[PDB]
């Protein structure tokens, strides 16, 4: 031991991640003629709690009949889930929304149904995300979207107003330029630009307003509008292969799972 401790017992590793592949496959019977000693146990001992359970004679389940494994995070959360939606009402306006992992921020100003469930299953998130925005409404509208890391100057979140920034400051952060007649969709990465190791969701105090947000996406539109037509944007998040997840955590209860 490096720390100078001593013990006569054995210390074992508790709750090892990923103990089994969640597809039916083969890595005779499962239980058999031998008497099941794993039926009776002591749960207060972490060594005896790792014993394989059996009580009844069984046999092997066989193999499944679909190729993919739906119980993996990189395939479950590879599906792009809903993030936010908002509408514009006037000309030359600017809207700003952060991607906050915190569970204190309730929707509409926070993570909705499935993303609120997922980012409170674990402690630490580190890596780039994957944003898709969808344009619904007017046509011949020129818009520009850019990405600001946390700790830098930007307009007020969740408020649609005129922009107090200049065009030299917007285009220096990296921006895209679209038109609502040609595309109707933008599939854009979001870089991992932070000064800290990883961001977390389940925090309070001044750690909730610092270590929860990691990035911040804002959109400005021009050439809107003519007489009577609405313009609506909707955002969707997916996860990438460069991202990582650490330290599993107790899931949210049935009163914190909220939606829009």
């Amino acid at each position: 031991d490096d720390s100078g401790g001593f013990s006569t017992t054995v210390s074992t590793e508790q709750n090892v991640p990923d103990p089994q592949v969640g597809i039916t496959t083969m890595r005779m019977d499962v239980s058999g003629v031998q008497a099941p000693v794993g039926a009776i146990t002591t749960i207060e001992d972490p060594v005896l709690a790792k014993k394989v359970p059996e009580t009844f004679p069984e046999l092997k389940p066989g193999e499944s009949r679909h190729t993919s494994d739906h119980m993996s995070i990189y395939k479950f959360m590879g599906r792009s889930h809903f993030l936010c939606t908002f509408t514009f009402n006037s000309n030359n306006k600017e809207y700003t929304f952060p991607i906050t992992l915190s569970s204190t921020s309730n929707p509409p100003h926070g993570l909705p149904s499935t993303l609120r469930w997922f980012f409170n299953l674990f402690q630490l998130y580190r890596g780039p995300l994957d944003l898709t925005i969808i344009i619904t409404g007017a046509t011949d509208v020129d818009g520009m979207a850019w990405f600001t890391p946390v700790g830098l100057a930007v307009d007020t979140p969740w408020v649609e107003k005129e922009s107090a920034l200049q065009i030299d400051y917007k285009t220096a952060l990296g921006a895209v330029r679209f038109n609502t007649r040609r595309t109707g969709n933008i599939q854009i990465r979001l870089p991992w630009y932070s000064y800290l190791y990883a961001v977390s969701g389940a925090l309070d105090g001044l750690g909730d307003k610092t270590d929860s947000t990691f990035g911040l996406v804002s959109i400005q539109i021009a050439n809107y509008n003519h007489s009577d037509e609405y313009l609506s944007f909707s955002c969707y998040l997916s996860v990438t292969e460069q991202s990582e997840f650490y330290f599993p955590r107790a899931p949210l209860n049935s009163n914190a799972m909220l939606s829009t």
């Binding site: 780039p128 994957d130 990465r189 990438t240 460069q242």
Partner: protein
Amino acid sequence: MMRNETRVSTTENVVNLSNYEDARAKMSFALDQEDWKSDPSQGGGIKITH
């Protein structure tokens, strides 16, 4: 993070009716994108190419 971008050049969606390399079809009404074999049975073997 995928990096696959192309620049849309000039002559966008223009029909060139002057040669077979630009007039050949992009898709097909036929099932399974199938092809047809040669059958010189009822034509006597008299086939024109020129």
